Write a protein that binds this DNA or RNA. Structure first.
Lengths: 102, 54, 108, 123, 119, 101, 298, 32, 123
RNA sequence: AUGGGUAUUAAUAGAGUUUUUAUCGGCAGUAUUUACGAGAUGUA
RNA sequence: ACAGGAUCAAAUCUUCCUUGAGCGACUCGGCAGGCAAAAAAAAAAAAAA
RNA sequence: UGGUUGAACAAAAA
RNA sequence: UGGAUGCGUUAAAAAAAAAAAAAAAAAAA
RNA sequence: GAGAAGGGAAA
RNA sequence: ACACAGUCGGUACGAAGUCGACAAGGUAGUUGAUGG
């Protein structure tokens, strides 16, 4: 659930332990499946968790698909995290609408 | 009545005013006079139906 | 007073020299089933559909009975009900699948 | 025997207005009159529940007709009673005692116990 | 109000002697008897005829005409309220289920609220 | 209108290990698939699939409701959700935490 | 719940304390307060069939007709027979009028049935039964059936339950002949059933064989002629006899099949039922028509 | 009025097979 | 013919007016519990289905409608070319509310979404 | 009213109460039954 | 339940859609009633104190 | 082939 | 103030009727 | 295709 | 017990886990066989 995903992201942030390929695949699949339920804070948390370990599997595009809807409830910290992550992770001139929304 | 309830709920000028919390008093109630109630006696007849089994 | 009902040989030719001496039907010619005129030519039959459910283990067959012989269909249905088509058949249980047959009015 | 046969044989049966005592009708009438006389003399009798229920009506009839004080009712009471002691008790004690009682001069009390010797309910 | 609040219909949909919104006037015969006795009491106490009606044990009710007038106005308002609420509930029931309660047509024990027996 | 056979199918022979496991495994699979579902459509499809499996419990109903709320609600008139609502009303008095429902 | 003697004496003294007889009007008028707002007339089609109604058997008496002919007649009372619901194809899968009759004490009524009665806005009912009918003949909920439902002279199909006679042998239950009272007949054979079947070839006793048992208590149907009706007390006087005890439930409906074709083809009937017009005056008592030919002619 | 097998059943019948699988006699020659 | 028809004709005569007071089979495709008019493309189709389920003739249905409808509706029926029931079933003419109500009374089921009137008000 | 401080009807959180017959005699003692949830992932 | 939903938005009184058939229908949920007593042809007939 | 059909008939065929 | 019976009276109509004792999408209680 | 003349029902 | 009441056979654990697992997926630990 969302709480379990939040706990997983927090665990990934607290330590620098290298996780397994199966873990990465399952986590990415679950995040993509739950993307429409993510609050801006949890979305920023998951984006930072992926960015820190430098794993890209389309998760950034999948999150950007839904982020403009969740931006309206974003706090300052979440806005900072989302800007920092997406500005670097999204392809140049990919989703200008998302940056405009931010 | 429903009309008066709606009037109060629509009014933007009517309030329940209290300078201090202890101002508020229970709504005043007028108690009507009594008269025989065979209907209520009938209801009691139903209510006491199964006392022997208890 | 009462008498015998009118059968199928009261409404057609009779050839005593032929093996099929007269054509017999479930009803009279005017009483045979038919499709409502404006609600016709909208449907087609796949004649047989199979549903496999590996979780519950209860599989389904759905068969079209239009134009089939009663006994010819009954033997096949009995095979499916017993489950003798399955490699794990057991005589001591209802080891077959479930069966639905449609268009029983059109059995011959 | 079998208890359910009571239900089986009473399905669709009426209760007898009078409970029949043993013997022939003259003997039954004599028994009822004798026990009515004894009841008058004793003010209370320990009987079987059915017998008390049966004799109650005759006790009530005796009192009702004794109160009326006419030759006809006197003859009725005479036909009901046997002994001079019962006659005296009735007329000189029960009638004045019930002078203002319109009806219902007796009562039957179920003892809620079975008689030891023969398991007869008592009252 | 900007967002209208919806009252609950359970008081209308619960049929028991513990639900007044539904059992207030039931049964109609005893409702009629209650109304008749209330009217008789009002006429025999708030409009005295100089004699003790003896309909009930006596009460020390006001006798001044000034008080009697206000009591009569209160009773008239109560009567109007009860009549109007009964009429409205009957209309709602008719429009909803087509159910309608009328006056008895014949002199029968059931109309008298008595059981039919051999006597 | 209806299926011809509505009398209860009472097996007159005891099940085998596999048969009984298949009979009873809904108690695991229902909650597992409710948890795995990330959409009201999936939740209602799973509930409808297990509609005939008895006997449902208050925690089953509560898990369904919680998952629906988390996924983001559904039409309260969809017949699949009406199954859940009617079941809840049926077992209302047996709920310990009715206010949570 | 008194003693046997007390009940016997009260039965004896019953007559002394009867209520005075009421005054029966000759004509009556009906206002809107006694007419269901949704009750409207209908002209039937070939398939239209009206509903029956429920009555209590009250007693029997002898009445003279116009020519001076004496008929034994049974009096039945429609004691507040009221429509409580309608069955419909889409809502119930069939069509019928549900009718409740009688009065039951509340202390004897159950709570869910009390809720049903409160929803119906009626006093607690004694009995409830259905009457299947045509769609056009459905009556509105709350309407009270009147004896005017039946035109005097019509034939009515009546159903009821016969009385119970207890356990009876073959002689009394089926009128078996028994044996001679003399001529050496054995005691056990005086009222015996004799043989009860064939022999070793068939080797059974056939089902439905007549033997001793608990007699009575069967559903019995008959035909009656509507002799008279009184609207004031909802009394219907039917020519003949009716099964059941005094005070037992009776279903009364229009004659059907052969009886209808032979007797009711020309007697007009109200559809769906008698529909009063406000302000109009109607007779209180109605008699069946007299015979055209003189019964005492020979 | 106002995965081919899975899609067709969803579109026409209006419910989801989920893990269940369906086939019709039209495809028998592919397995014979 | 003579004073007697053919036995086939007599049997068909008897069977012509068969009237069953039951719907006694759930395997039939006919109006039953839970009937929905919207299952059919239009009111004409629903009406034809309901009438065929009832086993009634177009002429009898039309006669009942004509004889039970009001005077103005009767005049409109007379003015309309052809048979109104046939046109409705064919989906050629739109009936009025009163005409539909009488048709529904005849066939036992609604033909459009039936509107019930509640007495609810939001505060 | 260049308009909603704005006009009308809060019983409002409380529409709440035991009839009739009856001179006198008699019954009314007991048992069964509703959470076959995992309160709980406890109020964020 | 007019309970939820759609719309350049409904005659008072819903234009429609949903509610697999709003649990077969209507009710109840401190509902329901086996035995005793007292009555009792099937049944019916006692509110509690 | 036609409801034409109780012990009655018409059409077509070879 | 009544009970039973026929030697009395009524009916001979309905059978998808009168009526009944097991609402059943509940496939391992 | 048969006393297929045990039951179902088949070209 | 359908049973002269016996005889021959008679259920095949776990994944009920999951930080799972050649060619495609449009990511479902889903899929490959099949035009008259």
């Amino acid at each position: 659930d969302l709480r379990k995903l939040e706990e997983t992201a927090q665990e990934l942030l607290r330590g620098k332990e290298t996780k397994r390929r199966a873990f990465w695949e399952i986590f990415s699949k679950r995040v993509k499946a739950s993307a429409h339920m993510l609050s801006p804070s949890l979305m920023a948390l998951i984006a930072k968790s992926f960015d820190v370990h430098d794993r890209d599997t389309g998760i950034y595009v999948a999150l950007a698909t839904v982020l403009p809807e969740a931006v309206k409830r974003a706090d300052g910290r979440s806005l900072l995290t989302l800007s920092d992550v997406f500005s670097r992770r999204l392809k140049r001139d990919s989703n200008p609408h998302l940056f405009s929304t931010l | 009545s429903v009309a008066s309830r709606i009037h109060f709920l629509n009014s933007r000028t009517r309030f329940q005013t209290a300078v201090h919390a202890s101002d508020v008093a229970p709504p005043f109630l007028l108690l009507p006079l009594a008269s025989p109630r065979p209907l209520l006696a009938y209801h009691h007849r139903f209510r006491t139906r199964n006392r022997k089994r208890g | 007073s009462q008498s015998y009902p009118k059968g199928s040989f009261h409404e057609g030719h009779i050839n005593p020299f032929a093996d099929v001496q007269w054509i017999s039907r479930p009803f009279m010619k005017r009483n045979m089933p038919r499709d409502h005129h404006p609600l016709a030519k909208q449907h087609t039959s796949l004649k047989a559909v199979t549903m496999l459910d590996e979780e519950s283990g209860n599989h389904w067959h759905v068969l079209d009975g239009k134009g089939r012989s009663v006994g010819g269909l009954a033997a096949q249905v009995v095979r499916l009900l017993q489950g003798k088509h399955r490699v794990d058949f057991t005589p001591r249980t209802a080891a077959g699948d479930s069966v639905i047959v449609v268009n029983a009015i059109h059995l011959k | 025997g079998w208890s359910k046969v009571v239900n089986f044989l009473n399905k669709g049966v009426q209760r007898r207005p009078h409970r029949r005592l043993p013997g022939q009708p003259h003997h039954q009438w004599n028994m009822l009159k004798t026990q009515l006389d004894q009841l008058v003399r004793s003010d209370r009798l320990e009987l079987t529940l059915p017998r008390a229920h049966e004799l109650q009506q005759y006790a009530e009839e005796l009192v009702h007709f004794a109160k009326q004080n006419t030759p006809e009712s006197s003859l009725i009471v005479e036909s009901m009673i046997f002994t001079p002691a019962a006659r005296r008790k009735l007329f000189h004690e029960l009638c004045p005692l019930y002078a203002n009682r319109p009806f219902f001069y007796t009562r039957v009390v179920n003892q809620h116990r079975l008689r030891m010797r023969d398991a007869a309910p008592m009252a | 109000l900007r967002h209208r609040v919806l009252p609950s219909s359970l008081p209308n949909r619960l049929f028991s002697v513990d639900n007044r919104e539904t059992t207030r006037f039931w049964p109609p015969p005893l409702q009629k008897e209650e109304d008749e006795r209330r009217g008789a009491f009002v006429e025999s106490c708030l409009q005295p005829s100089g004699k003790a009606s003896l309909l009930q044990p006596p009460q020390c009710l006001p006798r001044a005409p000034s008080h009697l007038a206000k009591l009569m106005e209160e009773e008239e308002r109560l009567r109007l309220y009860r009549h109007l609420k009964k009429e409205e509930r009957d209309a709602a029931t008719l429009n909803k289920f087509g159910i309608w309660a009328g006056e008895p047509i014949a002199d029968t024990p059931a109309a008298k609220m008595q059981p039919l027996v051999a006597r | 209108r209806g299926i011809e056979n509505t009398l209860r199918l009472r097996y007159n022979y005891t099940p085998t290990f596999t048969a009984k496991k298949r009979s009873e495994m809904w108690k695991v699979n229902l909650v597992k698939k409710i948890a795995h579902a990330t959409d009201a459509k999936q939740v209602l499809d799973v509930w409808t699939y297990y509609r005939h499996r008895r006997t449902k419990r208050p925690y089953h109903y509560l898990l369904a409701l919680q998952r629906l709320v988390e996924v983001g609600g559904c039409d309260p008139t969809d017949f699949r959700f009406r199954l859940i609502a009617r079941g809840i009303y049926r077992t209302a008095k047996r709920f310990i935490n009715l206010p949570r429902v | 719940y008194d003693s046997r003697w007390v009940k016997r004496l009260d039965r004896l003294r019953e007559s002394k304390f009867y209520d005075p007889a009421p005054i029966i009007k000759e004509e009556e008028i009906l206002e809107a307060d006694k007419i269901h707002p949704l009750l409207k007339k209908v002209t039937p089609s070939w398939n239209s069939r009206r509903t029956g109604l429920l009555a209590y058997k009250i007693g029997m008496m002898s009445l003279w007709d116009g020519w001076g002919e004496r008929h034994a007649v049974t009096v039945c009372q429609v004691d507040r027979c009221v429509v409580m619901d309608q069955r419909t194809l889409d809502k119930d899968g069939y069509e019928a009028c549900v009718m409740g009759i009688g009065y039951k004490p509340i202390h004897k009524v159950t709570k869910p049935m009390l809720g049903v009665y409160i929803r119906s806005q009626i006093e607690p009912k004694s009995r409830i039964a259905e009457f299947k009918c045509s769609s056009d003949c459905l009556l509105p909920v709350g309407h009270e059936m009147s004896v005017r439902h039946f035109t005097p002279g019509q034939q009515v199909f009546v159903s009821g339950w016969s009385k119970d006679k207890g356990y009876l042998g073959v002689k009394k239950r089926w009128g078996f002949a028994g044996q001679n009272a003399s001529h050496g007949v054995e005691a056990k054979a005086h009222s015996s059933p004799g043989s009860i079947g064939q022999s070793k070839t068939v080797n059974v006793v056939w089902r439905f064989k007549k033997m001793a048992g608990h007699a009575g208590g069967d559903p019995r149907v008959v035909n009656c002629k509507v002799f008279r009706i009184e609207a004031q007390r909802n009394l219907i006087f039917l020519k003949g006899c009716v099964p059941g005890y005094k005070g037992s439930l009776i279903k009364i409906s229009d004659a059907r099949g052969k009886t209808h074709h032979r007797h009711n083809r020309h007697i007009p009937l109200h559809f769906p039922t008698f529909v009063p017009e406000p302000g109009v005056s109607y007779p209180v008592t109605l008699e069946c028509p007299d015979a055209e030919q003189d019964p005492f002619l020979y | 009025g106002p995965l081919e097998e899975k899609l067709r059943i969803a579109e026409e019948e209006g419910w989801d097979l989920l893990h269940r699988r369906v086939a019709s006699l039209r495809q028998l020659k592919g397995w014979l | 013919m003579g004073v007697l028809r053919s036995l086939y004709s007599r049997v068909s005569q008897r069977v012509w007016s068969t009237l069953h007071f039951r719907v006694g089979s759930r395997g039939q495709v006919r109006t039953n519990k839970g009937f929905k008019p919207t299952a059919f493309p239009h009111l004409g189709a629903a009406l034809f289905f309901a009438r065929m389920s009832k086993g009634l003739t177009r002429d009898s249905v039309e006669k009942f409608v004509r004889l039970n409808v009001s005077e103005a509706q009767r005049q409109e029926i007379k003015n309309w070319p052809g048979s109104v029931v046939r046109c409705i079933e064919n989906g050629a003419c739109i009936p009025s509310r009163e005409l539909q109500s009488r048709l529904e009374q005849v066939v036992g089921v609604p033909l459009t979404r039936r509107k019930k009137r509640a007495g609810n008000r939001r505060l």
